[PDB]
Amino acid sequence: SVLYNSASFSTFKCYGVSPTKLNDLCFTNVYADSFVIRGDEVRQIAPG
Amino acid sequence: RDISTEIYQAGSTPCNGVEGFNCYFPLQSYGFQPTNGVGYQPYRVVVLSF
Protein backbone atom coordinates (compact mmCIF):
# COMPACT_ATOMS: atom_id res chain seq x y z
CA SER A 1 0.00 0.00 0.00
CA VAL A 2 2.84 2.42 0.79
CA LEU A 3 4.31 2.01 -2.70
CA TYR A 4 0.87 2.53 -4.24
CA ASN A 5 0.01 5.70 -2.31
CA SER A 6 3.45 7.32 -2.23
CA ALA A 7 4.01 9.50 -5.31
CA SER A 8 7.77 9.55 -5.83
CA PHE A 9 8.18 7.06 -8.71
CA SER A 10 8.09 7.19 -12.50
CA THR A 11 6.82 3.66 -13.27
CA PHE A 12 4.57 1.45 -11.16
CA LYS A 13 2.68 -0.49 -13.85
CA CYS A 14 3.24 -4.22 -13.37
CA TYR A 15 3.66 -6.29 -16.53
CA GLY A 16 2.78 -9.52 -14.72
CA VAL A 17 -0.12 -8.93 -12.33
CA SER A 18 -3.21 -6.75 -12.24
CA PRO A 19 -2.40 -3.37 -10.62
CA THR A 20 -5.66 -3.31 -8.62
CA LYS A 21 -4.30 -4.65 -5.32
CA LEU A 22 -1.88 -7.42 -4.37
CA ASN A 23 -2.27 -7.53 -0.57
CA ASP A 24 -5.14 -10.01 -1.09
CA LEU A 25 -3.57 -12.79 -3.18
CA CYS A 26 -0.95 -15.09 -1.66
CA PHE A 27 2.34 -16.30 -3.16
CA THR A 28 5.58 -17.82 -1.89
CA ASN A 29 9.33 -17.26 -2.32
CA VAL A 30 9.14 -13.67 -3.53
CA TYR A 31 11.70 -12.88 -6.22
CA ALA A 32 13.27 -9.45 -6.65
CA ASP A 33 16.11 -8.37 -8.95
CA SER A 34 17.53 -4.85 -8.78
CA PHE A 35 20.20 -2.84 -10.57
CA VAL A 36 21.19 0.73 -11.45
CA ILE A 37 21.04 2.19 -14.96
CA ARG A 38 21.80 5.42 -16.74
CA GLY A 39 18.80 7.67 -17.35
CA ASP A 40 18.87 7.04 -21.11
CA GLU A 41 17.91 3.33 -21.07
CA VAL A 42 14.67 3.80 -19.12
CA ARG A 43 12.88 2.28 -22.13
CA GLN A 44 14.35 -1.20 -21.56
CA ILE A 45 12.09 -1.98 -18.57
CA ALA A 46 9.41 -3.75 -20.60
CA PRO A 47 8.63 -7.32 -21.75
CA GLY A 48 10.82 -8.53 -24.60
CA ARG B 1 -24.98 2.55 -21.95
CA ASP B 2 -22.21 4.74 -20.53
CA ILE B 3 -21.13 7.91 -22.30
CA SER B 4 -19.25 9.88 -19.65
CA THR B 5 -15.56 10.78 -19.82
CA GLU B 6 -15.10 12.72 -16.58
CA ILE B 7 -11.73 12.49 -14.83
CA TYR B 8 -11.37 9.17 -13.00
CA GLN B 9 -9.67 9.62 -9.64
CA ALA B 10 -7.60 6.55 -8.77
CA GLY B 11 -5.66 7.38 -5.60
CA SER B 12 -6.58 9.21 -2.42
CA THR B 13 -5.17 12.55 -3.59
CA PRO B 14 -8.06 14.67 -4.94
CA CYS B 15 -7.88 15.42 -8.66
CA ASN B 16 -9.98 18.19 -10.21
CA GLY B 17 -8.03 19.57 -13.17
CA VAL B 18 -6.14 17.75 -15.92
CA GLU B 19 -3.79 14.81 -16.49
CA GLY B 20 -1.92 14.13 -13.26
CA PHE B 21 -0.90 11.34 -10.94
CA ASN B 22 -3.52 8.75 -9.84
CA CYS B 23 -6.20 10.43 -11.98
CA TYR B 24 -6.71 9.69 -15.68
CA PHE B 25 -9.44 9.83 -18.24
CA PRO B 26 -10.73 6.40 -19.26
CA LEU B 27 -11.02 6.22 -23.05
CA GLN B 28 -8.10 4.62 -24.89
CA SER B 29 -7.99 4.06 -28.64
CA TYR B 30 -7.78 0.76 -30.49
CA GLY B 31 -4.73 0.16 -32.66
CA PHE B 32 -5.61 -1.04 -36.17
CA GLN B 33 -2.63 -1.06 -38.55
CA PRO B 34 -2.42 -3.17 -41.73
CA THR B 35 0.63 -5.01 -40.38
CA ASN B 36 -1.24 -6.71 -37.52
CA GLY B 37 -2.13 -10.31 -38.30
CA VAL B 38 -4.98 -12.40 -36.94
CA GLY B 39 -6.49 -11.33 -33.64
CA TYR B 40 -6.14 -7.60 -34.34
CA GLN B 41 -8.46 -7.06 -37.30
CA PRO B 42 -11.92 -5.44 -37.16
CA TYR B 43 -14.58 -7.99 -36.24
CA ARG B 44 -18.18 -6.89 -36.75
CA VAL B 45 -20.64 -8.07 -34.10
CA VAL B 46 -24.43 -8.15 -34.37
CA VAL B 47 -26.60 -9.30 -31.46
CA LEU B 48 -30.27 -10.25 -31.89
CA SER B 49 -32.60 -10.46 -28.89
CA PHE B 50 -36.12 -11.87 -28.68
Swiss-Prot record, chain B:
Effect of residue 19 to D: Increased replication in human TMEM106B overexpressing cells
Effect of residue 31 to S: In strain: Omicron/BA.1
Gene source species: Severe acute respiratory syndrome coronavirus 2 (2019-nCoV)
Name of the protein this chain belongs to: Spike protein S1
Impact when changing residue 28 to N: Reduced host ACE2-binding affinity in vitro
Annotated region described as Disordered, given as residue ranges: 1-25
Disulfide bonds: 15-23
Effect in UniProt of substituting residue 40 to H: In strain: Omicron/BA.1, Omicron/BA.2, Omicron/BA.2.12.1, Omicron/BA.2.75, Omicron/BA.4, Omicron/BA.5, Omicron/BQ.1.1, Omicron/XBB.1.5, Omicron/EG.5.1
